[PDB]
Amino acid sequence: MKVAVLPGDGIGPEVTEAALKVLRALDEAEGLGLAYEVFPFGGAAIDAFGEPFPEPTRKGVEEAEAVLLGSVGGPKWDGLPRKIRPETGLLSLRKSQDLFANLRPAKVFPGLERLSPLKEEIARGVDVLIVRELTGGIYFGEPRGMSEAEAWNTERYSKPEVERVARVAFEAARKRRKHVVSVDKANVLEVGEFWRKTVEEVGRGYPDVALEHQYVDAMAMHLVRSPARFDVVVTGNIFGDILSDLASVLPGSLGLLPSASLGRGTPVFEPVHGSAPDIAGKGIANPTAAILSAAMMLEHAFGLVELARKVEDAVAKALLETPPPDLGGSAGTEAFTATVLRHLA
Amino acid sequence: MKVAVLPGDGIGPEVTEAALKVLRALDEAEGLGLAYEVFPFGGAAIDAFGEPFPEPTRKGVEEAEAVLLGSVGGPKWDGLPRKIRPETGLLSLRKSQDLFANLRPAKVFPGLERLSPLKEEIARGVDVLIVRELTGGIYFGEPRGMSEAEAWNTERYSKPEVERVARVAFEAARKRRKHVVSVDKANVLEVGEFWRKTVEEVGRGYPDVALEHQYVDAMAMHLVRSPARFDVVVTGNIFGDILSDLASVLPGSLGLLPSASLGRGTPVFEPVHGSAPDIAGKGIANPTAAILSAAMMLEHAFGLVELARKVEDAVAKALLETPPPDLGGSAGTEAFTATVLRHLAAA
Ligand SMILES: [Mn+2]
Ligand SMILES: [Mn+2]
Ligand SMILES: [Mn+2]
User: What is d(CA B206, CA A17) in angstroms, rounded to the nearest whole number?
Assistant: 53
Q: What is the DSSP letter of B297?
A: I
- Of A148, A18, A45, A165, nearest to A103 by C-alpha is A165
* Chain A residues near residue B225 by CB distance under 8 angstroms: 117, 249, 252
Contact state of A150 with B159 under an 8 Å Cβ cutoff: yes
3-class DSSP assignment, residue B39 = coil
Sorted by sequence, the CB contacts under 8 Å of residue A70 that are 6+ apart come out as: A6, A7, A8, A9, A11, A12, A13, A15, A16, A270, A271, A290
* Chain A residues near residue B140 by CB distance under 8 angstroms: none
Q: Rg for chain A (alpha carbons), in Å?
A: 20
Cα(first)–Cα(last) distance of chain B, in Å? Answer: 21
- Of B315, B304, B339, nearest to B31 by C-alpha is B304
Report the binding-site residues of A. 74-87, 94, 104, 132, 217, 241, 245, 274-286
Sorted by sequence, the CB contacts under 8 Å of residue A314 that are 6+ apart come out as: A22, A340, A341, A343, A344
- Of B241, B213, B247, B226, nearest to B128 by C-alpha is B247
- Of B262, B215, B332, nearest to B105 by C-alpha is B262
CA triplet A300, A96, A136: central angle to 5 degrees? Answer: 80
If you count them, how many residues does chain A have?
Answer: 345
- Cis upstream peptide for B13 (omega within 30°): no
CB-CB contact of B223 with B188 (8 Å): no
CB-CB contact of B46 with B80 (8 Å): yes
Ligand index nearest the alpha carbon of residue B104: 3
Q: How far is the CA of B242 from the centre of ligand 3 (A)?
A: 7
Which residues are paired to A132 by β-bridges? A102, A235
- Of B258, B212, B201, nearest to B235 by C-alpha is B212
Min distance B114 CA to chain A CA atoms (Å) = 9
User: What is d(CA A40, CA A50) in angstroms, rounded to the nearest whole number?
Assistant: 11
- Identify which of A146, A191, A217 has the shortest CB distance to residue B241: A217
Contact state of B154 with A152 under an 8 Å Cβ cutoff: yes
Dihedral of alpha carbons B18, B23, B27, B33, sign: negative
- Of A17, A141, A239, nearest to B220 by C-alpha is A239
A133 backbone dihedrals φ, ψ, rounded to 5°: -75, 125
Sheet with B232-235: strands ordered across: B35-38, B2-6, B66-69, B268-271, B258-263, B99-107, B127-133, B232-235, B179-184, B210-215
CB-CB contact of A163 with A170 (8 Å): no
B113 is in an annotated binding site: no
- Identify which of A116, A188, A238 has the shortest CB distance to residue B139: A188
CB-CB contact of A158 with A136 (8 Å): yes
Q: Residue B172 maps to which CATH number?
A: 3.40.718.10
Q: What is the DSSP letter of B135?
A: S
CB-CB contact of A247 with A227 (8 Å): yes
B323 is in an annotated binding site: no
User: What is d(CA B150, CA A195) in angstroms, rounded to the nearest whole number?
Assistant: 10
Min distance B304 CA to chain A CA atoms (Å) = 33
User: What is d(CA A142, CA A10) in angstroms, rounded to the nearest whole number?
Assistant: 37
Best mutation site among A144, A155, A193 for testing chain B: the one with the most B CBs within 10 Å?
A155
CB-CB contact of B261 with B95 (8 Å): no
User: What is d(CA A309, CA A28) in angstroms, rounded to the nearest whole number?
Assistant: 17
Contact state of A155 with B159 under an 8 Å Cβ cutoff: no
Contact state of A151 with B193 under an 8 Å Cβ cutoff: yes
User: What is d(CA B335, CA B347) in angstroms, rounded to the nearest whole number?
Assistant: 20
* Alpha-carbon distance values, A58 to A5, A53, A65, A90 (Å): 12, 7, 13, 11
| 3-class secondary structure per residue, A233-288 | EEECHHHHHHHHHHHHCCCCCHHHCEEEEEECCCCEEEECCCCCCCCCCCCCCCCH
- Identify which of B153, B158, B248 has the shortest CB distance to residue A190: B153
Dihedral of alpha carbons A158, A162, A167, A168, sign: positive
User: What is d(CA B70, CA B67) in angstroms, rounded to the nearest whole number?
Assistant: 10
Torsion angle of the four alpha carbons B113, B114, B119, B125, in this order, in degrees rounded to the nearest 10: 0
| A245 is an active site residue | yes
Contact state of B221 with A246 under an 8 Å Cβ cutoff: yes
Q: How far is the CA of B220 from the centre of ligand 2 (A)?
A: 10
User: What is d(CA B147, CA A190) in angstroms, rounded to the nearest whole number?
Assistant: 10
Total tally of structural domains belonging to chain A? 1
Dihedral of alpha carbons B311, B314, B320, B322, sign: negative
CB-CB contact of A168 with A134 (8 Å): no
- Identify which of B150, B195, B250 has the shortest CB distance to residue A156: B150
Ligand index nearest the alpha carbon of residue B220: 2
**C-alpha B275 chain-centroid distance:** 16
Q: How was this structure determined?
A: X-ray
User: What is d(CA A113, CA A111) in angstroms, rounded to the nearest whole number?
Assistant: 6
Q: How far is the CA of B244 from the centre of ligand 3 (A)?
A: 8
If you count them, how many residues does chain B have?
Answer: 347
B338 is in an annotated binding site: no
Strands B150-158 and A150-158: antiparallel
User: What is d(CA B183, CA B248) in angstroms, rounded to the nearest whole number?
Assistant: 17
Min distance A20 CA to chain B CA atoms (Å) = 32
* Chain A residues near residue B151 by CB distance under 8 angstroms: 156-157, 190-191, 193-195
> Which residue among B139, B178, B313, B326 is the active-site one?
B139
- Could you tell me the resolution of this structure in angstroms? 2.5
User: What is d(CA B247, CA A165) in angstroms, rounded to the nearest whole number?
Assistant: 29
B173 is in an annotated binding site: no
A–B CB contacts, 8 A cutoff, strictly below: 140
CA triplet B85, B283, B8: central angle to 5 degrees? Answer: 20
> Which residue among A27, A139, A215, A326 is the active-site one?
A139
**C-alpha B9 chain-centroid distance:** 18
Contact state of B146 with A224 under an 8 Å Cβ cutoff: no
What is the domain range of residue B126? 1-347
* Chain A residues near residue B238 by CB distance under 8 angstroms: 185, 216
User: What is d(CA A177, CA B278) in angstroms, rounded to the nearest whole number?
Assistant: 36
**Count of C-beta atoms within a 10 Å radius of residue B334:** 15
User: What is d(CA B231, CA B209) in angstroms, rounded to the nearest whole number?
Assistant: 11
Residue of B nearest to A161 (CA): B150
Q: How far is the CA of B16 from the centre of ligand 1 (A)?
A: 76
- Identify which of A117, A145, A193 has the shortest CB distance to residue B122: A117
| B185 is an active site residue | yes
DSSP string, A147-208: -SSEEEEEEEEEHHHHHHHHHHHHHHHHHTT-EEEEEE-TTT-HHHHHHHHHHHHHHTT-TT
**Count of C-beta atoms within a 10 Å radius of residue B330:** 11
Contact state of B246 with A246 under an 8 Å Cβ cutoff: yes
Contact state of A249 with B225 under an 8 Å Cβ cutoff: yes
Burial of B187 (0-12, 13-18, 19+ CB in 10 A): exposed
Q: How far is the CA of A68 from the centre of ligand 2 (A)?
A: 22
> Which residue among B59, B95, B98, B217 is the active-site one?
B217
* Alpha-carbon distance values, B109 to A165, A224, B250, B319 (Å): 43, 19, 11, 8
Min distance A81 CA to chain B CA atoms (Å) = 18
CA triplet B45, B46, B52: central angle to 5 degrees? Answer: 70
**C-alpha B335 chain-centroid distance:** 25
Q: How far is the CA of A241 from the centre of ligand 2 (A)?
A: 5
**Count of C-beta atoms within a 10 Å radius of residue B264:** 11
- Of A135, A33, A105, A28, nearest to A269 by C-alpha is A105
> Which residue among B107, B185, B310, B317 is the active-site one?
B185
Amino acid at A100: F
User: What is d(CA A66, CA A315) in angstroms, rounded to the nearest whole number?
Assistant: 21
CB-CB contact of A277 with A78 (8 Å): no
Min distance A44 CA to chain B CA atoms (Å) = 27
**C-alpha B73 chain-centroid distance:** 17
Amino acid at B87: E
User: What is d(CA A172, CA A175) in angstroms, rounded to the nearest whole number?
Assistant: 5
User: What is d(CA A104, CA A134) in angstroms, rounded to the nearest whole number?
Assistant: 12
Q: How far is the CA of A47 from the centre of ligand 1 (A)?
A: 21
Report the binding-site residues of A for Mg(2+). 217, 241, 245
Q: How far is the CA of A236 from the centre of ligand 2 (A)?
A: 13
Element (H, E) at A313: helix A305-321
User: What is d(CA B162, CA B159) in angstroms, rounded to the nearest whole number?
Assistant: 5
Which residues are paired to B151 by β-bridges? A157, B146
- Of A43, A41, A40, nearest to A74 by C-alpha is A43
- Helical residues (DSSP H) of chain B, grouped into ranges: 12-30, 43-49, 55-63, 86-96, 120-123, 159-174, 190-203, 216-225, 237-248, 288-296, 305-321, 333-343
